[PDB]
Amino acid sequence: HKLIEAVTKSQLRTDLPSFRPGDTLRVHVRIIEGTRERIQVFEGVVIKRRGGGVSETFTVRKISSGVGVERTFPLHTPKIEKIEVKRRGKVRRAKLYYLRSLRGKAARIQEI
Amino acid sequence: YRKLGRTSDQRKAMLRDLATSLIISERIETTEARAKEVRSVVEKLITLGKKGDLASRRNAAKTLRNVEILNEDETTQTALQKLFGEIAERYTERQGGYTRILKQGPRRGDGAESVIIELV
Amino acid sequence: AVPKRRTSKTRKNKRRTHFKISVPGMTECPNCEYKLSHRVCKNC
Amino acid sequence: TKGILGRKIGMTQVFGENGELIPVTVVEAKENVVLQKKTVEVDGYNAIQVGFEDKKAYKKDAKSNKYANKPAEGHAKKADAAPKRFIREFRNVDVDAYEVGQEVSVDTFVAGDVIDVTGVSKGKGFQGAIKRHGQSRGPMSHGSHFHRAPGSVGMASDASRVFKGQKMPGRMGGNTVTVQNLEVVQVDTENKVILVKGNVPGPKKGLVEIRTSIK
Amino acid sequence: MIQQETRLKVADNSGAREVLTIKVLGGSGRKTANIGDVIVCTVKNATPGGVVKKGDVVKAVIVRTKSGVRRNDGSYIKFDENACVIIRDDKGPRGTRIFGPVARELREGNFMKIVSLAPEVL
RNA sequence: UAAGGAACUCGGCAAAAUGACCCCGUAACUUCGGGAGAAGGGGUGCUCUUAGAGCCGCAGUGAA
RNA sequence: UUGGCACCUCGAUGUCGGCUCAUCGCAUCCUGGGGCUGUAGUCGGUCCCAAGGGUUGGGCUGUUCGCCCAUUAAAGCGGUACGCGAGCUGGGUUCAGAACGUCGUGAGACAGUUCGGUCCCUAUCCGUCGUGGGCGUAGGAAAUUUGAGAGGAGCUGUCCUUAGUACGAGAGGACCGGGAUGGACAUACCUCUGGUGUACCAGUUGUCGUGCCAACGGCAUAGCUGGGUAGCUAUGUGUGGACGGGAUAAGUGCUGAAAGCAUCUAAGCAUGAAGCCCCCCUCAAGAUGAGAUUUCCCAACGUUAUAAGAUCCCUCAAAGAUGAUGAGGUUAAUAGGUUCGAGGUGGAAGCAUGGUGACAUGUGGAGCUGACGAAUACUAAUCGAUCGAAGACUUAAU
Ligand SMILES: CC[C@H]1OC(=O)[C@@](C)(F)C(=O)[C@H](C)[C@@H](O[C@@H]2O[C@H](C)C[C@H](N(C)C)[C@H]2O)[C@](C)(OC)C[C@@H](C)C(=O)[C@H](C)[C@H]2N(CCCCn3cc(-c4cccc(N)c4)nn3)C(=O)O[C@]12C
Ligand SMILES: [K+]
Ligand SMILES: [K+]
Ligand SMILES: [Mg+2]
Ligand SMILES: [Mg+2]
Ligand SMILES: [Mg+2]
Ligand SMILES: [Mg+2]
Ligand SMILES: [Mg+2]
Ligand SMILES: [Mg+2]
Ligand SMILES: [Mg+2]
Ligand SMILES: [Mg+2]
Ligand SMILES: [Mg+2]
Ligand SMILES: [Mg+2]
Ligand SMILES: [Mg+2]
Ligand SMILES: [Mg+2]
Ligand SMILES: [Mg+2]
Ligand SMILES: [Mg+2]
Ligand SMILES: [Mg+2]
Ligand SMILES: [Mg+2]
Ligand SMILES: [Mg+2]
Ligand SMILES: [Mg+2]
Ligand SMILES: [Mg+2]
Ligand SMILES: [Mg+2]
Ligand SMILES: [Mg+2]
Ligand SMILES: [Mg+2]
Ligand SMILES: [Mg+2]
Ligand SMILES: [Mg+2]
Ligand SMILES: [Mg+2]
Ligand SMILES: [Mg+2]
Ligand SMILES: [Mg+2]
Ligand SMILES: [Mg+2]
Ligand SMILES: [Mg+2]
Ligand SMILES: [Mg+2]
Ligand SMILES: [Mg+2]
Ligand SMILES: [Mg+2]
Ligand SMILES: [Mg+2]
Ligand SMILES: [Mg+2]
Ligand SMILES: [Zn+2]
């Protein structure tokens, strides 16, 4: 009954900080396409965590030039070099979908 | 889970009524599908009664009906009190399986399978 | 929507070939006449 | 050239060398044994017969398929093996390279092998034309009284009949399906597991047959 | 997921403000376009003084979608809006400036000038 | 109900949207009554003090 | 097609267009093969073979038709009651109202127009799609199978390279090969992204209850709102069809006479299409021609009881309208319960503390948790009953 876990255990990462929805993360994402491999930081608030094991994902949202952007990552993807927990948010639900229609001050998340 | 030919609210109410009736009378005759559904309800209630804490009692109060039971001699108690009193003590050392279903056969009016479900 | 021709006696009985009931699944009561299998006596 | 029997456990994902996401199907292929060699001389064609999952030994008054009956017990005992739940033939193998009674481990397949996976698709029950044959609905408004019906089933006086093969409601699913050119992602000797790229037919716990791709 | 009659904001300074998708290019029966695809569209709203006038039928490349795209590593990017950039025949933008972030996928389509002009590529 | 938003269809048919109360604001035209609820905006929960100060939620005519 | 004829139907053969669903022809729109060219190349023109597959989304109009916008490899022409209303619609057309123009003294009418205007039917037979029971298949049975035969599939774009080469003043720009990658379509599947998720978690309004507080229950679309497991799912994730062999079409030949020559043909010998038969997928021995392999079982006197093997009955789900199929039936994990997990929700109650209070913090990633996983006989799969062979004959090899 634990075959899936047994064969996907080697895929899991152990260098991952603890975080919950509402936290502000700095995600250091590897970019390999082009002529060189480099690192682009994506900073935003975690609006979603879902799944379990190797299939777990999380979603981060930021505003770039006034346009909302969301990146969803597999939690254990090798493409992520590291994650910093920059801020800890005070929120009341697991999914922060209500942020999607909020802008500016109304979209602010109180820190802990 | 079975729908029992009823809407969700009606089914929930019927299951509460059947569970309280079973707790009170300790042995009831119903149809096969209703009994197979209510065994789970009644046994989870008995689990709460064995737990015994205040939160368990209130969770049990979410499901039980407000019925009164006249005991041996003009002394009253509620179905919730019986569930957390005599019934819970009866099954302290039994790990699940507090009910049993005995089939009786079809009944005249509609050919439905009548069964007895009783506390063990 | 409606039968074009009436159904003969032969065709009707052919169709009723499978229209029947079966003997109940019944067992002798070792101590308590006969009973349905996996049912209690409920009268003995 | 190769074949093995297994049960579908479920779907998961692994990360490739380049960090690419590879959805995979976990197939558990323990306990495979060659039960019989069929040859051109005796049977008219060459194949090996492979039993997959061990059953309980025969007992009197057995009521279910969990226990081998006497014919099955004798057939398996002829190969010095326990009776098996599933038995299938592989005509794509080399009959010479197998001995009756030998095991068929997962290690017969290697990472990067291209395989064909055969299984029985999930059942759907009685289904209408819209779901079973991908047909279009009629209008949902504008006075329509035609939503999920199959539509016209023929022409007229010519031909005064419905042609064979007209697509109609009926039982859907539960058919044998072969998915070609899947790949072996990983073979794990412990747990006797083969990781297959992509999805394969059937419900969880269903039997699947894995063969080296014919194409 | 852009189809016929989908309206998209324009993310350049060509003079078009909003366009309406007339056609998704790329083969018969194609219904949907996404980031990096080329569409035919008409200008519904335009800024006065701009090069591209209301009513013109033009070609645009999609640079932002709400549906977003899935990348090979199992990661996704989605945007809060659908936006496109009006392009010439040789894939160069008709305007001089690009507004808003654009997806990395435009590199694969060789929309390199649009990529260079964008404030952010994600 | 994703994305789209009349591409449906003879026709937006049907559905969706609007909707109560209080306060701003309101065009052409006009028989000077009207048009007009034009349009378009804002507010609303709970606690305390005498209009402010707070408290909670995604959301306060929180349903109809 | 417009007609001509008036042979079936006036004790009724529903008319146009669209929708749904197709099916057939080839006089071929695309794609494949080829001859001629006033064929340099890139493109074309014309003719021959070829029906395998493919062959579009809008504006206007009831429209068919047609014009237009934007695509596409292409947007072929036809038959099937101008295919399809006991499958749908009902905009148009042969209905009662009304109006205009016009005609008529008039009632009224129309090489006309305009607004409005009931689409009934529980499928008996054949036909079709699925799914069972009987018997047969020279003993009975369990499983694995061959494949006579049948169905399915069959499309194609762009880019790179060859090569800026051949061709060509130039402009321009290849055939043949090599590689990459899409559109449409089909199919499987739920890891992912999402949808749903009426016995999952939470917030919240009105009102009535559980005597009151607190905590809860009922009703209001599941009262409403934010999320959401399994399952089922597409817009999501995989996979498939550009192959190879054989025989051919139009063609192209070689050898070669009749007919000293010439000649693809008359005898022979080749070569040559997305087309044919196979190669790929599925079904398939009621294939009454009823096939094959392995294993199991073996009775006496039509009867009675049996063997292998099954069923009845019962617990069920991966299966399912019901049958059927599959997992199990105590020598037992089949379901329920119980205990522990995954996932979901997001911080229970009670109590303490702070605050006038609304509330906040702590105890504490808490409490709760359908369908998912494991363990555990606590509950239910009791007892029992029913069906079920004994292998015919004739001739040949041994
Ligand atoms: C909806 C029910 C009616 O069906 C229809 O109206 C239709 C849709 F079924 C219909 O029109 C059929 C199809 C007609 O037949 C066609 O006649 C054409 C001339 C020729 C055609 N073919 C041969 C080419 C025939 O098929 C005709 C004549 O009905 C008028 C059939 C005859 C036998 C006929 O009169 C029958 C008896 C007709 N009728 C008069 C209705 C008369 C109209 N009506 C009355 C009512 C009503 C009355 C009382 C209460 C309520 N609530 C409603 N509703 N509608 C009824 O009372 O019932 C039905 C069956
Ligand atoms: K209430
Ligand atoms: K608490
Ligand atoms: Mg989670
Ligand atoms: Mg039910
Ligand atoms: Mg209700
Ligand atoms: Mg449609
Ligand atoms: Mg309807
Ligand atoms: Mg929607
Ligand atoms: Mg939406
Ligand atoms: Mg809109
Ligand atoms: Mg339209
Ligand atoms: Mg249309
Ligand atoms: Mg309406
Ligand atoms: Mg109101
Ligand atoms: Mg407010
Ligand atoms: Mg004629
Ligand atoms: Mg005559
Ligand atoms: Mg007539
Ligand atoms: Mg008649
Ligand atoms: Mg021809
Ligand atoms: Mg063809
Ligand atoms: Mg065509
Ligand atoms: Mg017709
Ligand atoms: Mg009609
Ligand atoms: Mg008809
Ligand atoms: Mg009409
Ligand atoms: Mg006159
Ligand atoms: Mg009208
Ligand atoms: Mg065959
Ligand atoms: Mg036949
Ligand atoms: Mg191609
Ligand atoms: Mg899942
Ligand atoms: Mg999901
Ligand atoms: Mg209270
Ligand atoms: Mg009441
Ligand atoms: Mg046979
Ligand atoms: Zn009895």
Task: Locate the domains of chain B by residue range.
Answer: 2-120
Contact D120, D207 (CB under 8 A): yes
Shortest Cα distance, chain C CAs vs residue B101, angstroms = 10
At E44 the three-state DSSP class reads strand
Task: List CB-based contacts (under 7 A) with strand F.
Answer: A 91-93, 98; D 139, 141-143; E 1-7, 65-67, 82
- Beta-bridge partners for D50: D34, D88
Could you tell me how far CA D114 lies from the centroid of its own chain? 16
* Method used to obtain the model: cryo-EM
How far, in Å, are A27, A38, A93, E10, E104 from residue E77 at the CA level?
14, 19, 23, 19, 10
What residue spans of E39-106 are helical by DSSP H? none
Q: Where are the domains of chain A?
A: 1-107
The 3-state DSSP class for residue D201 equals coil
Which residues, other chains included, contact D152 with Cβ-Cβ below 8 Å and sequence gap of 6+?
none
What CATH number should be reported for the domain whose range is B2-120? Answer: 3.90.1030.10
For residue D14, what are its two tokens? 């692994």
| Residue D159: cis peptide before it, omega within 30 degrees of 0 | yes
Sheet holding B113-119, edge to edge: B27-31, B113-119, B99-106
Residue D212: closest CA among D120, D122, D91: D91
Domain that holds residue C30: 2-44
Range of the domain at D105: 1-215
Report chain G positions within 7 A of protein CB atoms.
19-23, 55-58, 69-75, 80-81, 83-90, 121-133, 141-147, 151-152, 157, 182-194, 198-199, 210, 215-220, 222-223, 226-229, 231-233, 235-241, 279-283, 292-297, 308-310, 312-316, 318-321, 326-331, 333, 336-339, 342-350, 365, 367-371, 373-374, 376, 378-385
Task: Say how many Å lie between the CA of residue D29 and the centre of ligand 7.
Answer: 45
Distance from CA of B37 to the nearest CA of C (A): 19
Are E104 and E22 contacting, i.e. CB atoms less than 8 angstroms apart?
A: no
**In Å, how far from its chain's centre is CA D149?**
32
d(CA D25, CA D14): 10
> Residue D37 region, left (φ>0) first, then alpha (ψ -120 to 50), else beta?
beta
Question: Where exactly are the structural domains of chain E?
Answer: 1-122
Interface residue C42 vs chain B (CB under 8 A): yes
Query: How many residues can be counted in chain E?
Result: 122
The resolution, in angstroms to one decimal, equals 2.1
Judged by 3 or more CB pairs under 8 A, whether A touches C is no
Architecture of domain E1-122: Beta Barrel (2.40)
CB D105 within 8 A of CB D185: no
Q: Which two tokens stand for residue A103?
A: 């802008």
Give, rounded to a whole angstrom, the gap between the first and last alpha carbons of chain B.
Answer: 23
